[PDB]
Amino acid sequence: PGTVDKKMVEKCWKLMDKVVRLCQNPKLALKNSPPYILDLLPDTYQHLRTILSRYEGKMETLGENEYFRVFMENLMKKTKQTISLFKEGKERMYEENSQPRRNLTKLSLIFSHMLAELKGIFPSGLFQGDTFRITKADAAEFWRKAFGEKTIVPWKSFRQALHEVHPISSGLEAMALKSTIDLTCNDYISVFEFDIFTRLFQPWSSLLRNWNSLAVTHPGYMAFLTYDEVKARLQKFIHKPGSYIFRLSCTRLGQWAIGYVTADGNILQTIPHNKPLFQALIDGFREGFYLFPDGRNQNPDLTGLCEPTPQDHIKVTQEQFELYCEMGSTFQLCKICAENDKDVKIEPCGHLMCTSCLTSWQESEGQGCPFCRCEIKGTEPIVVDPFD
């Protein structure tokens, strides 16, 4: 959009600073919980600062990176947007139910989403975007076939590419999708945003049908909602146990957060991890917990998408076999516990193991792939078919 000099990275800073000084207002009394402006802006600043150090003398090649150009433009537009939110909102900023106030919360979400995206692309401050690893592999294969190593694509370019595989049947449906997937609200789709959405909406094969069933037609789906908002909304239902809703989790993006009312009248919030949303919704209904979406007596039947095309089997190779024999065992077997065949694939890294060991590792407050220790963004169940 425009080239990034250090006068500009300067201008953003001054602007972020104003937005902070506004939000420090004693009359505002923002709740400290994610997303939280008084964390997000400083932390974004910190991270930017970190990227700048890394690019010293290389400022030429950083200024020319398209993702970064798009980020700094959106970041400026958004802060500016926030600053004039206050300006026009006047005192209506302090009425917690005020529309200005809800827009400010929408903005908190976005700032959060932007920082996560930024950390994703520049994890240590160094630009990884071209190497970014998409969690789900069918999703990965799509992006790579269509977009190469591009970190970011215009919305219309994304819409056209995707439509070729998963047909979007209309303009309205296209708008709904853009609004769901464009988390930073910049009219672009990052490889990062692609990751979040494909994780949220897996499996890839039924990704549009999935998204239709879980968001478009579903009374329980809440877009751009906050943990605190989810709590408030379910308050009206505290007397109807089984009432539930769900939303993107902001502190772990690409994971779902389900709020629900309990037999005794408490509002609790849970994250299914590694487990696809529908199964959770299906089990939760069957088991009595998730009953009346957003309070409604009618609960959708998701058994429709319960029948996914099965992931294939990996099929050990003559090469592999002879190797694992000279090692003394079978490739097929989980090299962690040593008593099981590998039933699960860690994503994005690809490493194979048994679910028991995966579960025990996670429950042990251990983190990331026990092998390469990269973060576990996804799991795909599998079966290995040995060479013999």
Binding site: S33, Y227, S249, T251, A257, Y260, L268, Q269, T270, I271, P272, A280, G284, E287, F289
Partner: peptide, 9 residues
Amino acid sequence: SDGYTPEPA
């Protein structure tokens, strides 16, 4: 202590 509890059983 992030606000999130374990899944209902």
